[PDB]
């Protein structure tokens, strides 16, 4: 996946002969590599003057734009045709910037290969002084003109991957139909199904999550909100929705098959209890594959993000860190399932370990918020966010103490229940207000025509926001109660059922919340992550 | 093709793959039926040899498009409404999903309120309704064109003989078992070869093709090679008729069966050899006099790898022998019990033969003008 192929897609057909021969430049190094002192110095210098000719074209465009733009304003003041004129110029602006920056990545990798041939320090410092501070970076007039036009007028995927998505989605839907049929017809056995549907819930809470990030990226891209710059990915490559849909469908197939095998009775040599282990082991291996296949770039990026987030205090916080920390805050059911599986398979909550593994993601997020406060050194909204996330620890620990007292029979159970319901109310209201105010930006003072919405809107129909608001109000109450029950306070038998039927709703809440969080981050700048 | 139709192809192909796996598993495990049912729900063969035909026609159009041969000019389709291979694969997958679901429902035991004999009827009625849909959706243009072409073919002597007419006439010449299975369905649902129907309805495609050729000859007045083609297609008439006569003769049991079989086998060998020679020389143009570097190939070739030709030639040689024996045996001379499995395991191979023949016929017809159909 070298950049030479990538640029070949974005090279203007008309200016094909005007692009530099970077691809041919790479070859000659290998041939010259695959008397020493004096022959080498001079021929290196021929790579500098070549860029001058191309540099001429961008410079002259600045003068042309001003002269061309000014004249047509007067005549217009004194419909479809008028707008078509500016389309050509706007498109050409973008690719000029693409050429400039992405050219940096090329020579640097190749330069160091020959640097060690002679084992000298002069070559390394040669480029530092005469490249970085070149005046090419002092051009800023481009941005000024873009904004001027808008103010005046307004105020006054490859076929093959799509086929793969279709294949996986079809096999997944039919596998679901078969699984439902088998569950409803061929499960008359009574062997405590719950220790199965609990361990296998940690597949659904992730398959749903990726199937939902699919639609999430769909909405992000084809709605006018850029999801690449803020996520600081490489603009060169991007995972469209189709890629996420196929990656999620693959794990969906490898989950449905394992579940089915656990349901039916394959060859007796294979015990019934090994399939979940095989499935989760394969998933972990697929995540941690050290080879160069199966979307190694994205997997490596995600692995690096996980490493950075799970030891947040020692690493600077970007946006991706916060986003994944929050997603893990919501997907605590996956951690609970993993811990339960480990304990179950080691044995066949004693020391409250279930509480610890339930609160771990809130710990990550809270420590990340504290680190952000330390770096930025401003109280608001960082300590407010920290307190919001600390309410989760308070909730879980207080519920655990209440359950322990209830088991012991101490008379303080009533007071513990009272203070616990108080904590429920405060934390639910506080997190809801926070989510509606800062994470989305809704309920602003300056919104007259849109009523209780942002001053500027992005998604087409306000009904979307209006329904999503009530959805979040009625579902955020489910999150805290779900975690409280999963803390197995009392939970005689009917707690796991409610937890299982509610966790997917929590993932759905995260889907909506993601929609609006990134919309807000692009429109306004709520978190000071940019500039 | 548009992204959405590619996704639909993915969906239908995936559901088809899993349905096939389920069908194999259900047949191997959940078939607790020792009653003689197998050779009475072996009438879904008549839909299987249509599903596979549609898949292979999709592959044919893809191969034509990629290799370079233009299938649109020859098939006199409007260039603004071409049917790229994705559409064919999608529609074939859809029909395959319907077929698999029907067979599955028949295998299992759903609510007893409905009988087990209605599923094949429902599937075939759905297929015909979809084909003849009077609405303006679901490829209304292509379906209407196919219907008109079918009308033209079935009444070949009356209307003009175009390339599509002859091509589909040949296609139906290969797919005789579908007509045989339609006749079987009619007879079985009536009772639930007394009149020799199993032979006439099995050779009718030969009649269509032969009379079409004769009409072309009469309207053009040139024997070479229309008369030869007529002879080739009449060999099928003779084969089937003599096979039926032998069946009746053996049933009666007089003392002429040895000579009857001698002459029948002589007729078989001569007809098969002569039709193979025709297919190789007149139809395909191979073995041209002027080909030194190409050895036994045309002076011009289109498909890159010559190994494809070197394999397909021998494949046709070895499979065309199978088609004639298959038709004779489906004519059930005596074939007490060892015929209705061989016919089934051979017919899909026959459709595969017709697939490769399509490849090379259309290639040759574009390259040369073996069919006096242009200019």
From Swiss-Prot, chain A:
Protein name per the record: Solute carrier family 53 member 1
Mutagenesis or variant effect for residue 403 to C: Decreases phosphate efflux. Decreases phosphate efflux
Effect of residue 112 to A: Decreases phosphate efflux
Site feature Gating residue for phosphate transport, where: 479
Membrane side Cytoplasmic: residue ranges: 1-156, 225-237, 312-316, 378, 441-459
Record note on what altering residue 476 to A/C/L does: Decreases phosphate efflux
Activity regulation text: Allosterically activated by inositol hexakisphosphate (Ins6P).
Outcome reported for the amino acid change (mutating residue 529 to A): Increases phosphate efflux
